Amino acid sequence: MKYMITSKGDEKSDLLRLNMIAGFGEYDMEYDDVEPEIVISIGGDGTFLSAFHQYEERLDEIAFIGIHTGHLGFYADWRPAEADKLVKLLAKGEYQKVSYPLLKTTVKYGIKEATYLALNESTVKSSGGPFVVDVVINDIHFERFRGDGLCMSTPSGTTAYNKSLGGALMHPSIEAMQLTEMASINNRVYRTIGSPLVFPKHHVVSLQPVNDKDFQISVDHLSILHRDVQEIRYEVSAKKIHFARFRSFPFWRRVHDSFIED
Amino acid sequence: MKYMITSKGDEKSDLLRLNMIAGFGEYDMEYDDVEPEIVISIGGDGTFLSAFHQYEERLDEIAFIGIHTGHLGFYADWRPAEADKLVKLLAKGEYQKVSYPLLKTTVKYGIKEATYLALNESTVKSSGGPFVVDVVINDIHFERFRGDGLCMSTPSGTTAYNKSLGGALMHPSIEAMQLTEMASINNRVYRTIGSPLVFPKHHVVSLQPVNDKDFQISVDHLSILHRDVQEIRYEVSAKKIHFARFRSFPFWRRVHDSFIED
Amino acid sequence: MKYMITSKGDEKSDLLRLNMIAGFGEYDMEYDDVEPEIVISIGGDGTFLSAFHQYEERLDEIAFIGIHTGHLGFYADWRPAEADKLVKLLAKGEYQKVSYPLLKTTVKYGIKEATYLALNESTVKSSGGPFVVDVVINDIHFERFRGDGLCMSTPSGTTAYNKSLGGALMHPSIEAMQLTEMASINNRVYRTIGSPLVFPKHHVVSLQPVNDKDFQISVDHLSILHRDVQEIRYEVSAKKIHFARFRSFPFWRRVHDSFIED
Amino acid sequence: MKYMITSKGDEKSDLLRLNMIAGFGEYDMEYDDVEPEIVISIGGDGTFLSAFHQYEERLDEIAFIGIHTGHLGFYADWRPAEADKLVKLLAKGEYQKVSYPLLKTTVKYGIKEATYLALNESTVKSSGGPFVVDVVINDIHFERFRGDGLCMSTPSGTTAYNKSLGGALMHPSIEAMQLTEMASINNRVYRTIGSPLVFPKHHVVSLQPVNDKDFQISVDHLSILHRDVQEIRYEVSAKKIHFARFRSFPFWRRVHDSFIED
Numbered sequence A, B, C, D: 001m002k003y004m005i006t007s008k009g010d011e012k013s014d015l016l017r018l019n020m021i022a023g024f025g026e027y028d029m030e031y032d033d034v035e036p037e038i039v040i041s042i043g044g045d046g047t048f049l050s051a052f053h054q055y056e057e058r059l060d061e062i063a064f065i066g067i068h069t070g071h072l073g074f075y076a077d078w079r080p081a082e083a084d085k086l087v088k089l090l091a092k093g094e095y096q097k098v099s100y101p102l103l104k105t106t107v108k109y110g111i112k113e114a115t116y117l118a119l120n121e122s123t124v125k126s127s128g129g130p131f132v133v134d135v136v137i138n139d140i141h142f143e144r145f146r147g148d149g150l151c152m153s154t155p156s157g158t159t160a161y162n163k164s165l166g167g168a169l170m171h172p173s174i175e176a177m178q179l180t181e182m183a184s185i186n187n188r189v190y191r192t193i194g195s196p197l198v199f200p201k202h203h204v205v206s207l208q209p210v211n212d213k214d215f216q217i218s219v220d221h222l223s224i225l226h227r228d229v230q231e232i233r234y235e236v237s238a239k240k241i242h243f244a245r246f247r248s249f250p251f252w253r254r255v256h257d258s259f260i261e262d
Ligand SMILES: NCCCN(CC#Cc1nc2c(N)ncnc2n1[C@@H]1O[C@H](CO)[C@@H](O)[C@H]1O)C[C@H]1O[C@@H](n2cnc3c(N)ncnc32)[C@H](O)[C@@H]1O
Pocket: A044, A045, A046, A049, A073, A074, A075, A120, A121, A156, A157, A158, A159, A160, A161, A162, A164, A220, A221, C146, C147, C148, C182, C183, C184, C185, C187
């Protein structure tokens, strides 16, 4: 099939990429970075996030694979020594595909909307002043949040920023998104839930400005300052990222290997 | 239909129960506490947990309703002033039913198994000495836990003990269970994940003894000391508790009303 | 004595200030906002923080008083109805003074040092990229911190940002400072202590850059972007803020009244 | 001087103890386990806690030393390979002594008081039912605690149970004690501070029963069920444990070595 390979751009990843391209030249595999059906990312989870967003308009026609040239990644979960074995099995095909849920972010602004997809999370912080937003769940006012910010995570993202904020780790077969707080003010006057919140599909979480309407909005590794924002809306996307799998590497073992020992 | 009413047993709940029985006597509703199809609990969430376990063998043929004579409950979410309006709508029927997932707990012991269902959670603590268990997820060793104990929660239970342990709040339409730690030891020698873990249906979490094999095992409000325990196993039950609903009272508003303000 | 009054600048605070000035005109009290010996702040804790920094060069010759025209403050802990009783007792003098410890922040930058005093806390965040600093305690490398940032709090500051980050509340008679993390990355590769750390007088905590050397540094309500920073150093100051007291309002009751109920 | 040696009682510790006794026989050092002036503990922190409580009536006349035959301990902070070098320097004397603060626990019960000293912490849990106590600080009611229990820690104890409960780590030169919660219930009806609280010397924290008056009270490794308890009182002790030091091993390096890497 058509395939492309993206590289972190250090010497190890570049030369692994060139060696895999050579191995692919021995099969019926065309290098096409415009309409690939296989996207291989060589580097770390950061590289893999860039690959994802590089091809987010063709998610339904692409199976991703990540190779980690440094430590193990949750996405880049293949070792560089297995790259040849990877070339062959990928060339033959007949591989299974697994899908992880994604987070849809809608930003309504000015006197119009922008939509984004996140593989890890979307966060909202302030443009410097205090951060105050009303949190509305399915059109009912839930809380008035004052603090540093809010993080809305996919399942595969729960091991990332969400984790460092005290969120739960969620198996990626659960179609959900998780909201976590960053340093909420809680006293007699100001009140938030504190706990992470886990939302199923079709639930809509809306953040609405109270005073300042300029926010720093992040989607995975991208961080945009948005002006005249009237609303930020979160829901589980109907779109899914597809991974090529050649071997059982269970999520919970990936968790164990990354945080417990390996 | 056949119905029964359980009471917290204070004066307010007893007399509300007697008044509802009188109102039911004006319809084709038989009082039957052996095979009821409607179980009304009058009191607090504790009373409702007892009603649930009182009839856990007939969960598929019963719709539960909770009336709170004190503060609002997450199960006992009807006000005593609406009890007459409750009698009538229940008598006419045609009400919708909602189902919440349950937690199955299997205790394998001695030289044989006991199974329990939990509406809130099942927890494991030690018989006094140190608590050390191996946590095995789908037959793979995940961590060696040393600390006070572990809590495995249903979705509707996430607002209970789970919450106080830092777990996430999960919408009850998600078929899952959540594992939280109680005071884990973490140093250079001992290592746990720390984060809550959320498991989908068909995942099996197994706790296995390391030294001492006597544990205090709780299921909702019941706490049993178990001896010669070889294993404790958690999975989402195939069984579900059914609630009668007459009006939209969304879960997240119940959360708001219980923890944010009302 | 010489006195001045600072106002939040809303109608309630401005007119309370004018009424207290009139009451002071009935005694031997001169209004002097250049060398006051009494500084009254009327507003909220924010106003009081500004008063403190307005006169931080004359801390040894000033006793501060805060009046809260909104909710109770931890500094602005006098009610507007007691303002007349305040004028009289202040005019007579013979009041006791209480002192709270302060935090000294030294910023060494470029190819030279700036020093600041904090009543609540000093924090360090990144100029947008990832935040990575080496934490050095009394010249020994303690940890390599990667995450959102770090907060170093005084005792009276522990009820502020420090609290929202999970720090301990410390009685202000303890001469100490407390370091808390903001969303640290912890995995097999990256490791921080996680817990808040409480340092006595004469201990020096030094933050040192690893890659990027531009940081957002805050001191109480002031937030400065610092460039070519080589080091950030924290220690308990030898200087102390002095409060005028006329009545026992214990710290722990102030805590109770602000967070538990009032 | 007079000295004694306590052993964990495994083969490594017993034979190290016998070898040190032989080395001591080459100096003017008498083995006396009744009135020693030097108490050497060989084992882990558990062994050292037992040594402390074995001689808690002669704390002012004893300097303790801990040797760790397993992993590094916070008390047993000497390696077994340095045991000979230890014998000699101890024999010559002229060593410095360092003191750590202790926690005094007073239990008033029945229709009379018992007092205990803790090197790590004293905790209070329930005899099985729900745990509900009123927390009174310096005779003012601070909160009504409902949950699993409460932990009151010394400074050197903050790296132990306190840490696992989210308490701050405190340098042992600070004369203080720290109160942490175990799984507090927090909703609209029930309210605790949540944060750890750090108390200076002369502050008195009193726990008072609300319904049940049977509590499980722990002091370091000892756990006693107390009946007809009317009050539990915590304050910093006027007594201090004395360590013999022969070399700088700073507290914060001990923390680093135990939790960060070694
Ligand atoms: N250097 C390039 C920039 C990194 N960048 C690609 C990443 C990543 C990433 N994804 C995951 C994952 N799904 N499960 C577990 N591990 C993951 N990683 C690790 O995260 C560490 C730091 O990137 C590294 O080990 C990665 O291996 C953006 C992501 O930074 C996260 N992020 C931001 N601020 C954070 C904070 N304060 N605490 C924790 N994570 C934070 C957030 O989540 C973004 O999306």
